[PDB]
Amino acid sequence: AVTILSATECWDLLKSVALGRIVTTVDNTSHIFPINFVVQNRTVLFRTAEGTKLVSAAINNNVLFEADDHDVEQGWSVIVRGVARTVRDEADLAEAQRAELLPKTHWVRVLPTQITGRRFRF
């Protein structure tokens, strides 16, 4: 049947889950970084630890974001292609502070150039 998901459904499915992965890529070598994230107005907000390779690999680079969930009947997944941008604006920073993330430190947003979703049938 139909398994392609729409944008409004993709962004809300991402909010049902607290854990996703950043995927960075250089030439033919890629890295994956599990992150705790929240969705804010079609952006993927997460917080990054200083001096870690996630900061260097992602910030101001093209990245992949992925999150998924499943039950015994069906599963879904959402992929965001975009760019990781440091939260550096006053209004950007105030919005990031309203985020109910899991319990100095830098905020980062994945700004989407495309978002896609699939549902998988078991």
Q: Which residues are annotated as a binding site for FAD?
A: 34, 36, 47-49, 53, 77, 118
Angle at 47 between CA 114 and CA 95, to 5 degrees: 75
Torsion of CA 54, 57, 60, 64, to 10 degrees: -80
List CB contacts of 11: < 8 A, sequence separation 6 or more: 39, 42, 115
The one of ligand FAD, a copy of itself, none whose footprint includes residue 27, by CB under 5 to 8 A per kind, is a copy of itself
User: What residues from 9 to 48 belong to the interface with ligand FAD (CB under 6 A)?
Assistant: 19, 33-36, 46-48
SS3 40: coil
Residue 97 sits in the site that holds ligand FAD (CB under 6 A): no
- Compute φ and ψ for 75, nearest 5 degrees: -140, 160
Binds 48: which of ligand FAD, a copy of itself, none (CB < 5-8 Å by kind): ligand FAD
Q: Is 3 in the site for a copy of itself (CB under 8 A)?
A: no
- List interacting residues with a copy of itself (CB under 8 A): 18-19, 21, 23, 25-30, 32, 34, 36, 64, 66, 68-70, 72, 75, 77, 79, 101-103, 120-122
